[PDB]
Subunit: 137 residues, 2 copies
Amino acid sequence: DRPIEQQLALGYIKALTEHDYQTLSKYYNRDSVFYDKTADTKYIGTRSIIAFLQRSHEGVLEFDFNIEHMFNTGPLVVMIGNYHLRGPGEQFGKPGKIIDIAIPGVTTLKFDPNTQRLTEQVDLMDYQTMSDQLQSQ
Amino acid sequence: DRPIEQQLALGYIKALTEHDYQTLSKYYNRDSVFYDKTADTKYIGTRSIIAFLQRSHEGVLEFDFNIEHMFNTGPLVVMIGNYHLRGPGEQFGKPGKIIDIAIPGVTTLKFDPNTQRLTEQVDLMDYQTMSDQLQSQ
């Protein structure tokens, strides 16, 4: 019973968190922007975004976006929750360990309503909470 | 023991929600931006923003932002929560009545580290939930 724009957003998040790049790539064109505003990083276009997710998530054991609430205005979809990640810790400063983190965050997705491709994803992530958790591991 | 940027964010939200325009105007200058991304509305500068808030909140009986979680990376503060408003319903399509709503929203505030003034506020408000609440009013 969720609006179509919300079903689009869940499909996108399912592919991302399942590390399914064949499905995920269907949502991207050359002009898609993946922007983490909190980290001031941007990845642009199918090839660069996919390549970044491959490097980031290689070997990850668990990755989910636990959604507390979502809503939309037209093709802008807003999702509030937390990301949990479990995996080898090299890339988080913790070699030889499996890290486990639960990061509060807000993600927006804006789709082009005529192509159903992503125009912009914006992440706002609570990196201090991540740092605090990693210091104890 | 919150960082200074989160303290600024709380002072600003305190002034905004109390309708204390003298206190609130201390955060603004010629270039400050208020953007409601979910409403496609933008107001720039002290004069325009205060004029907009004064119009908007005229005769409002109760107003608050019940913050569930807040975090920041440097000058950018993210606040997740719920906006409660009780007041005249003309702007909300309920003329001659008092409406009472509780709206999930995410607000970001970016402050200038040199001056402590607001550079940009961005709102993401769940307007469909508002509309569903107004059905019974």
